[PDB]
């Protein structure tokens, strides 16, 4: 049997954490960067997440009505003397353990999407003398490094870097920043034209040759395109193979161009779709002859008429978002609305259920579209 | 804020030992669960002094008075818990569907260290019985 001992006061510093097989594998890895790390945005408001090197989990506490005692083996300083009163259902004791902790809850971990902390990130418009716009801000604490950014962000390292490259995040004069849409894509176009002007291998582009090919003509005083900017553009519109060279993608850039067209032409006034397809169609900046598809014209506009819409300007609360959405367009296409609500599910489960719960599903023969009340 | 989990000691001890076979972790730690509240005396010091040698109910370890409140008996899946001289609870040794990690949170330095991994527990879901 086992002798059970108890301390007069338990230490509440000890806590129980649920360990998934994946989390166990992660725990049992000698070199997983910083192994496992507890991360949080603030001290008194924001939630707390547990991050590995490539994944992010949300913590959930769950209390129970039972008594759970965490006990450990110890070698008793004094020989335990006791008269044996009952032998039934009992073997002779051979060890002594003592309860050092009493837990009343468990910590469940759920797989979740990592997000970036864009609290102290400025906007770059290509403006000269940016340092003054940096130092004269409310937060005297300036985001110096990317490590500092990751440390104060609810995400894993790889997710954080991937999203940082996905949003076209960059750094000027040692300060992290976000490029405006116009400047970012203009930079893209200039990069493309310059790369084709020097007959650069688009499948294997590097930083040095591209940088030299871009700012060779324009004077340095009006040349903001440094190697870091180039690296940002490449990390946004291309994929590296050996990780060291870059290879450009194609559908993402053309669709993004359709978005640029959108911010320019259908922000002020709307116009019937067949007409808009014609005018949109007359726009061909890229040398490469782009193809149209109905899937490409989805998620950046709303309706026999079409109008530009920015996702950032919509309310963040689901019910209100759907309310204003029902105010904006009486009849919706399925594929038009899927990308517009995918990112903001408060339930976080499934896609269709969210749509039917918050709207009126009214399919049709061509496609299973959506309707308003 | 943020801080890493230190699992080096746990890893060295884990690699040099088995995956858990019985209820004892390779590190010499276990998990006890009772459906109820554990009722203990209000004055530990007093009973430690009135405690007689025949009883051996109290002892000193590192300046702390520990009480021997019971015995645990494993005969397989079946388990029996003796409390005091007059109480018996029937329970089972169950394998955790989700293994629980025991971690020590050092508030002083805001550091977290992995203590051990529980794969089993001794649970008692039934009403305490007569001796």
């Amino acid at each position: 049997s086992i002798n059970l001992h108890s301390a007069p006061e338990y230490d509440p510093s000890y806590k129980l954490i649920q360990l998934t097989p994946e989390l166990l594998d992660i725990i049992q890895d000698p070199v997983q960067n910083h192994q496992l790390r507890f991360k949080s945005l603030d001290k008194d408001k924001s939630e707390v997440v547990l991050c590995s090197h490539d994944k992010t989990w949300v913590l959930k506490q769950r209390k129970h009505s039972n008594t759970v005692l965490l006990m450990r083996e110890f070698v008793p300083e004094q020989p335990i003397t006791f008269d044996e009163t009952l032998l039934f259902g009992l073997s002779k004791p051979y060890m002594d353990v003592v309860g050092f902790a009493k837990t009343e809850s468990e910590f469940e971990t759920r797989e979740t999407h990592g997000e970036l902390n864009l609290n102290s990130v400025p906007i770059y418009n290509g403006e000269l003398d940016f340092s003054d716009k940096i130092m004269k801000r409310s937060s005297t604490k300036v985001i110096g490094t990317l490590e500092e950014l990751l440390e104060n962000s609810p995400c894993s390292a790889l997710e954080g870097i991937s999203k940082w490259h996905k949003i076209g995040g960059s750094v000027k004069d040692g300060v992290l920043c976000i490029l405006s849409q116009d400047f970012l894509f203009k930079a893209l176009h200039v990069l493309l034209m310059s790369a084709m002007a020097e007959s650069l291998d688009l499948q294997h582009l590097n930083v040095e040759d591209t940088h030299h090919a871009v700012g060779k003509d324009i004077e340095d005083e009006f040349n903001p395109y440094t190697r870091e900017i180039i690296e940002t553009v490449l990390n946004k519109f291309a994929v590296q193979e050996q990780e060291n060279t870059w290879r450009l993608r194609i559908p993402f850039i053309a669709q993004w161009y359709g978005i640029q067209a959108l911010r320019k032409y259908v922000s002020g006034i709307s116009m019937p779709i067949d007409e808009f397809l014609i005018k949109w169609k007359s726009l061909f900046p890229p040398f490469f002859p782009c193809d149209i598809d109905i899937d490409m014209l989805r998620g950046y506009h709303f309706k026999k008429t079409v109008q530009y819409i920015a996702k950032s300007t919509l309310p963040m609360d689901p019910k209100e978002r759907f309310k204003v959405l029902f105010r904006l367009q009486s009849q919706w296409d399925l594929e038009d609305i899927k990308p517009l609500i995918e990112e903001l599910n408060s339930r976080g489960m499934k896609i269709d259920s969210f749509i039917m719960k918050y709207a009126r599903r009214k399919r049709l023969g061509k496609k299973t579209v959506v309707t308003s009340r | 804020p943020s801080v890493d989990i230190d699992a080096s000691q746990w890893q060295k001890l884990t690699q040099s030992r088995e995956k858990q076979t019985t209820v004892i972790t390779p590190l010499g730690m276990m998990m006890l669960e009772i459906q109820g509240e554990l009722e203990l005396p209000k004055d530990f010091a007093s009973l430690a002094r009135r405690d007689s040698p025949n009883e051996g109910r109290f002892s000193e370890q590192d300046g702390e008075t520990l009480i021997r409140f019971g015995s645990l008996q494993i005969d397989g899946e079946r388990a029996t818990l003796f409390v005091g001289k007059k109480q018996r609870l029937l329970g089972k040794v169950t394998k955790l569907d989700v293994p629980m990690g025991i971690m020590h949170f050092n508030s002083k330095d805001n550091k977290v260290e992995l203590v051990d991994v529980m794969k089993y527990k001794v649970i008692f879901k039934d009403r305490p019985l007569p001796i």
């Binding site: 707390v48 769950r62 | 509240e37 001289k85 609870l89």
Partner: peptide, 26 residues
């Protein structure tokens, strides 16, 4: 009298998961 005992609970209630604040930990 005065023997150690265990206050048995009639039922087992299980709470719903909750968000974790930094203050809840420390």
């Amino acid at each position: 009298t005065v023997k150690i005992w265990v206050k048995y609970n009639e039922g087992f209630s299980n709470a719903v998961r909750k968000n974790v604040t930094w203050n809840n930990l420390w």
